[PDB]
């Protein structure tokens, strides 16, 4: 059948957000290498270079943080609901439920005079919800994210009840950028056809958690994370790698070999933030350590112009470092992933706007005569 | 560049399902047309042939009705969430909500030797989250749907707190058939992405209810409904069509469409539905003759154009009929189209699966060095 299989083919819109060289290694927001707005910006100013198009000047910059600043309090009933749920609820799930709620009361209208500082708004609110599926699932009581100098600060602050060191809200921040936008998975996809009949914005996000929520998207971190933890010891690298993998048949996780041709640059810089919290904490080393060496097998034993760990092989160890456990590491890649999806269903909206609709094929029984129950 | 903007001709899957001849106006389910299902079996027995693949016998279609009876409850969240909302929050918003609490709290696994079982319980609680959303929005007190001899009447008992008639009964089994599937609309198409990645049925709900709550797809029963409502009285028929249609060429809402080049089957079935009302009650006849002049008028006009009543243009004055207020129209769509919505996802999972990864063309800006703040 004619069937556009996984839609793999198919170009959904134009964007000009962003490019994966994949032959070359480089991944650029808006032309800028993904190095140097980690090196020299900031989340804050990847928010404005996404939404309005160019880097910030000071006071443009200072525009974004003020509304940060005044937009992290949510409706009583998103906490309350978040709360009320069983604390072994998916974080996911509670973020869609969640987004739900933002959804139903405040509804906003799409209009290109105020799309870009909603987006800003909803950012604000996105850590507020991450921050408290944490308390909550944790049994604590909630916490809004407060104005502070950073948004990785002010979401980390909330989120631990403490003040942050500079080294994890770095981190943090990288993190952000780092996941901010990369192909059009199944979650930017769902948020995609959702804004595609003008569905606010909230709701958008909605669909985006709702696919984000299944285990061949979300969950990745977590399953490659969860290999080292096994491994238990660096020691027990090479056994593990051998009685698991090669005499083996279902195989290890946080490798990929299909974007691009050598390493994926975002993982890259994983690893380093890995390794900085690596030679300050000695559980951290201990991971660490793990994952360099099973790197190094994985790509020794598949070849290097194949395979390289993708960015989930590292990520979950700086998640680790900062004090997340594992079931918070899909929440965090949503987080950040919310920029994204924020700037595409915007980019569709207000410069692409197309209703989605595509075909099924009918096969299956010809007409048939109605036949009544007693003689079925 | 014209792209696949929309995926009007891309195939997203195969079909079993539903057929539809735009020519000779007809639609059929697994087989079976539309008008024989209506006249000659029920919901319970749909929900049965769509699942299953043909119409039950009697053990059969008493295992549906158990399957059913014994799965209106809902967990205490979805209630204490649904009631804490504004009163004005859109029905749509509200039962995405209520769907990402259910998605949370039961959190299903795929199982083909469960997922057939799973959708009849979610159909169960469509039900009982549908006729809350009413409540709560009218201040009414939570109630949950009881066992009773179908689906339609335990709907409408629970949602009005009274036994319906026995023509209520048939009017909503009818609209539960009428609206069960058709076509990939943006709603069908979510939930198929958030399926890809097995995201739980629950929250493949989820991501159609998103889609569904934008007014470019949801809000056509309201739409066309209103126009009679603004109309008034029979009197005023054609002076308003003449101002509205002729002169200030807006849209007849509830005429044309897509594949339909005859009248839609099911606008056929709704306006009988329609008209059986009208004779017993003055408030619908009202309604009910203003809509068969607009449709004359309608036909005179655009008739040679092949464009047609469909099947939201009568649709709302039978959910009128049966008591419900313009609000609830598209959360009624949701109610029967759901059914639709799971034997997609079902026929996906089980039969076609692949993870969904569209792809977007970069445009946008070349590479270029970064730019340190004080130089913007």
């Known amino acids: 059948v004619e069937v556009s299989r996984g839609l793999e083919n198919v170009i959904i819109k134009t964007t000009g957000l962003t490019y994966i060289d994949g032959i070359n290694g480089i991944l650029r927001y808006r032309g800028y290498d993904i190095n140097d707005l980690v090196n020299y910006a900031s989340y804050e100013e990847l928010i404005h270079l996404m939404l309005y198009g160019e880097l910030p000047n000071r006071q443009q910059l200072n525009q974004i943080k003020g509304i940060i600043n005044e937009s992290f309090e949510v409706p009583e009933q998103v906490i309350s609901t978040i709360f009320s749920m069983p604390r072994n609820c998916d974080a996911i799930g509670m973020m869609e439920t969640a987004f739900g709620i933002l959804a139903s009361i405040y509804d906003p209208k799409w209009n290109r005079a105020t799309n870009k500082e909603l987006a800003v708004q909803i950012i604000a609110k996105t850590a507020t919800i991450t921050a408290n599926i944490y308390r909550a699932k944790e049994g604590l009581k909630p916490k809004i994210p407060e104005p502070s100098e950073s948004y990785a600060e002010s979401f980390l602050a909330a989120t631990f009840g403490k003040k942050p060191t500079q080294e994890e809200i770095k981190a943090m921040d990288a993190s952000l950028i780092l996941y901010t936008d990369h192909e059009v998975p199944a979650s930017t996809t769902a948020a995609l056809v959702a804004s595609s009949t003008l569905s606010d914005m909230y709701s958008c996000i909605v669909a985006a958690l709702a696919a984000l929520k299944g285990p061949l998207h979300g969950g990745a971190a977590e399953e490659a994370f969860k290999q080292f933890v096994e491994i238990g010891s660096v020691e027990n690298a090479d056994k593990w790698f051998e ?86 590491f899909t929440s965090l890649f949503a987080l950040s992933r919310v920029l994204g999806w924020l700037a595409h269903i915007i980019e569709y909206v207000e410069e692409q706007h197309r209703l989605i609709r595509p075909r099924a094929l009918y096969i299956g029984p010809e007409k048939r005569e109605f036949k009544p129950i007693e003689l079925r």
Chains 1, 2 share one sequence.
Not at 252 to 281: C, Q, W
């Open 243 to 328: 009685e698991k993998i090669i005499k083996g048949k279902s195989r290890l996780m946080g490798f990929g070999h299909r974007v691009y041709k050598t390493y994926d640059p975002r993982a890259k810089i994983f690893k380093t933030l890995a390794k900085s919290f690596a030679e300050k904490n000695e559980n951290v080393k201990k991971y660490y350590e793990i994952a360099e060496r099973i790197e190094k097998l994985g790509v020794d034993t598949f070849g290097s112009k194949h395979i390289y760990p993708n960015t989930d092989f590292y990520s979950g160890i700086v998640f680790y470092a900062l004090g997340f456990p594992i079931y918070m």
